[PDB]
Design a binder for this molecule. Structure first.
Ligand SMILES: *[C@@H]1O[C@H](CO)[C@@H](O[C@H]2O[C@H](CO)[C@@H](O)[C@H](O)[C@@H]2O)[C@H](O)[C@H]1NC(C)=O
Ligand SMILES: *[C@@H]1O[C@H](CO)[C@@H](O)[C@H](O)[C@H]1NC(C)=O
Ligand SMILES: *[C@@H]1O[C@H](CO)[C@@H](O)[C@H](O)[C@H]1NC(C)=O
Ligand SMILES: *[C@@H]1O[C@H](CO)[C@@H](O)[C@H](O)[C@H]1NC(C)=O
Ligand SMILES: *[C@@H]1O[C@H](CO)[C@@H](O)[C@H](O)[C@H]1NC(C)=O
Ligand SMILES: *[C@@H]1O[C@H](CO)[C@@H](O)[C@H](O)[C@H]1NC(C)=O
Ligand SMILES: *[C@@H]1O[C@H](CO)[C@@H](O)[C@H](O)[C@H]1NC(C)=O
Ligand SMILES: *[C@@H]1O[C@H](CO)[C@@H](O)[C@H](O)[C@H]1NC(C)=O
Lengths: 127, 428, 98, 49, 49
């Protein structure tokens, strides 16, 4: 950004500062808030198993760690909805069971495990 | 020009295509309560803990709305359990569907008109719907069905409709040539079917021209999609004012929590922080209430759209003005950002004339009524025609039926009814 | 109106709504249902009622031979409606409540 | 606070009235400008006009 | 010092006020011309007076 000589700060549409000028050396710094989001637990009923998967939504999981075991446990799979931990990626496509989002569903199947796949709209047919 | 022995009957027709636009869903959004009200300040949180479960109620409400949106979309679009596809040969009897069928020459397999619709909608704010996170505890969630799956559903519906008729909505798709399907569609609105087979390419040309004019009217005019645009506008505006309410005083000393904390003692900063948290809580509640009301409106619109998809597309409707103005023939769907667009194809008459009429005909002391049609006279002779297209025929005993004598009907005329068996017996 | 409680007048007066309604009535009784699909086409009234009868499943035969009976019944029903409105006041509740 | 309560209730009432208006428009389109087969939509019996 | 509460209230009430006119227009204005009946009331024996 190209400040004028007499300007110091920089503001946004909603009046939130997003750029500053270093007082000692005259340069421009852009400010970005560090990440946040909610945590989601994907589980089949406790009647079936005590195993779960965790979704950190809206976070690029190059920095997930910051219970910890489900922070580097058995995988870190990146999806458009966030980082999924504890579930294994398959290549088949079935009907949706538990909706995760952005086109990704998850289910519990085979020695059992939790799988995440891309939902399928239906069979193909040519008339 | 009313009168009690005068009727007007059309002589030509016109095929018209019109558009209808409906919203279906809106943006899912979630809000963090403790971070919005006062973030990074522990002292404030201990004060906030004295109000109980307000934040939980807010979160539950927003989650309910978020789920209902995906429910709406699935109700509207997912009405077929197979994915049909059109054959590679395009012998459709003269009609030209090239402008609504998919185009595999694109990263997303959308048709021409869908591309126009997706380019007309513009959003003023940037990055308010891979990053999605707002300044203060505000987040937007992605929908469950990408924009590339909805296009597949629409393509399946179109292919099924143009290859199988209305039989794929009641069971298993059964194929049928397009010309015969259109003949049945005319038969459904009271016009004999030999009116199509003898006027086929005229109808094809009219249909093609109508589609062309639709393309122009979409690509030139700008204010077609207002209904879809104002939804985005309202959502952006509400979010904007929410964020903007963080720079007010509400009666306290300053709007920055750190300045109140770092200028007073804890026995006085409390009386200021309380005012601040009260104001911000009130703002949040106002936001969620307005969102609930808007969600109700959108749900009503989505239900209407689902009904139209069920009855105009998968069949042929008799309800007047439900599926466009005129006599309904058929309809086609298209997708658009946050909504759906229907193209209705309908029938309108033209070139009416003047004839004199009568309710019955006393032939031989017997009253003859028309089986299906109406009696007309061109000035000297009497014919019997169908009610929706001028086509006269001789009056015989096969298209009329007898009931009683002819001294009770008001306005009965004399004329001869020719008997087909009479010459077969006389020439014999 | 004392602290800011203003009320605005409607865009369509009560003398335009009546004219719209009269237009609808005249179209209906002079042209049938044809004016809701295109240009209005005229047809005698008795024949239009014959078409409607044929629509509900009864032969048109039945109307032409009982025309004046039906006319009398229709007129009497209209008269009864007029009396019932002119007598009782609790008929329009759903409006008054608003 | 009083104003807020008032406007909220007015919004809800307006939604109700809009629903009623849509129903009236549909009745005008279907019962008047045509002849209906939907049962009990335009009165009890077989509809004539 | 309370922010933008009054603008919100005014905006809501104005929205309702416009919606009313939309309702009335949608219900009644479904015809394109203004028809009228002839002066000779020969309607087959019925009465619409
Ligand atoms: C339609 O009904 C009217 C209703 O009154 C009848 O004509 C009346 O005309 C006056 C009142 O306007 C009254 O003194 C007469 O005795 C009639 O009842 C009539 O049944 C019919 N109108 C016509 C013109 O036939
Ligand atoms: C799916 O198959 C492709 C090959 O077509 C392969 O590259 C990819 O790794 C597979 N995905 C998984 C999750 O095994
Ligand atoms: C309508 O019927 C009456 C009844 O006899 C008749 O006098 C009149 O001529 C008819 N209409 C016309 C335009 O002739
Ligand atoms: C019907 O209209 C078309 C043009 O729209 C015209 O070519 C045709 O001749 C008309 N029908 C008759 C019978 O003239
Ligand atoms: C359908 O219309 C397009 C648009 O002009 C045209 O290019 C195409 O050739 C038409 N279809 C056929 C089979 O000619
Ligand atoms: C039928 O005759 C009337 C009486 O003159 C006339 O006004 C009307 O225009 C005629 N119909 C048509 C379609 O021209
Ligand atoms: C139509 O009317 C004219 C006028 O006299 C008549 O000559 C002709 O025969 C009538 N139409 C037919 C098919 O006869
Ligand atoms: C022909 O119709 C007239 C009515 O204008 C009627 O008086 C006459 O009796 C009818 N013909 C015969 C042979 O009766």
């Amino acid at each position: 950004k190209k400040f004028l000589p007499f300007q110091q700060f920089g503001r946004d549409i909603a009046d939130t500062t997003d750029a500053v000028r270093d007082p000692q050396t005259l340069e421009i710094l852009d400010i970005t808030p560090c990440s946040f989001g909610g945590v989601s637990v994907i589980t089949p009923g406790t009647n079936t198993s005590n195993q779960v998967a965790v979704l950190y939504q809206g976070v690029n999981c190059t920095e997930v760690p910051v219970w910890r075991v489900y922070s580097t446990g058995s995988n870190v799979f990146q999806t458009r909805a966030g980082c999924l931990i504890g579930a294994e990626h398959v290549n088949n496509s079935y009907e949706c069971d538990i909706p995760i989002g952005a086109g990704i569903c998850a289910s519990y199947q085979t020695s059992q495990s939790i799988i995440a796949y891309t939902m399928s709209l239906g069979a193909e047919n040519s008339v | 020009a009313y009168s009690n022995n005068s009727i007007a009957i059309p002589t030509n027709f016109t095929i018209s295509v019109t558009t209808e636009i409906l919203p279906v869903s809106m943006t899912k959004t979630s809000v963090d309560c403790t971070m919005y009200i006062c973030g990074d300040s522990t002292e404030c949180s201990n004060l906030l803990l004295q109000y109980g479960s307000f934040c939980t109620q807010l979160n539950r409400a927003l989650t309910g709305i978020a789920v209902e949106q995906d429910k709406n979309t699935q109700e509207v679009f997912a009405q077929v359990k197979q994915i049909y596809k059109t054959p590679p040969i395009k012998d459709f009897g003269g009609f030209n569907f090239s402008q609504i069928l998919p185009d595999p020459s694109k990263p997303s397999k959308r048709s021409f008109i869908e591309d126009l619709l997706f380019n007309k909608v513009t959003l003023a704010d940037a990055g308010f719907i891979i990053c999605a996170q707002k300044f203060n505890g505000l987040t937007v969630l992605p929908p469950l069905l990408t924009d590339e799956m909805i296009a597949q559903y629409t393509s399946a519906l179109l292919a099924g409709t143009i290859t199988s008729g209305w039989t794929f909505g009641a069971g298993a798709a059964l194929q049928i040539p397009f010309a015969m399907q259109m003949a049945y569609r005319f038969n459904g609105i009271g016009v004999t079917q030999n009116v199509l087979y003898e006027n086929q390419k005229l109808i094809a040309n009219q249909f093609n021209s109508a589609i062309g004019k639709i393309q122009d009217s979409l690509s030139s005019t700008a204010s077609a999609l207002g209904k879809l645009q104002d939804v985005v506008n309202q959502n952006a505006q509400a979010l904007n004012t929410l964020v903007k309410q963080l720079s007010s005083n509400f009666g306290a000393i300053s709007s920055v929590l750190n300045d109140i904390l770092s200028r007073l003692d804890p026995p006085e900063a409390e009386v200021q922080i309380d005012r601040l948290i009260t104001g911000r809580l009130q703002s949040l509640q106002t936001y969620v209430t307005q969102q609930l009301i808007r969600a109700a409106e959108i749900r009503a619109s989505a239900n209407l759209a689902a009904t139209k998809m069920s009855e105009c597309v998968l069949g042929q409707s008799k309800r007047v003005d439900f599926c466009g103005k005129g006599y309904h023939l058929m309809s086609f769907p298209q997708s658009a950002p946050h909504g759906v667009v229907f193209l209705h194809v309908t029938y309108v008459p033209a070139q009416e004339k003047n004839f004199t009429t009568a309710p019955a005909i006393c032939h031989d002391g017997k009253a003859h009524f028309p089986r299906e049609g109406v009696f007309v006279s061109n000035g000297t002779h009497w014919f019997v025609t169908q009610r929706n297209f001028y086509e006269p025929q001789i009056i015989t005993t096969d298209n009329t039926f007898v009931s009683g004598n002819c001294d009770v009907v008001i306005g009965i005329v004399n004329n001869t009814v020719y008997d087909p068996l009479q010459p077969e017996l006389d020439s014999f």
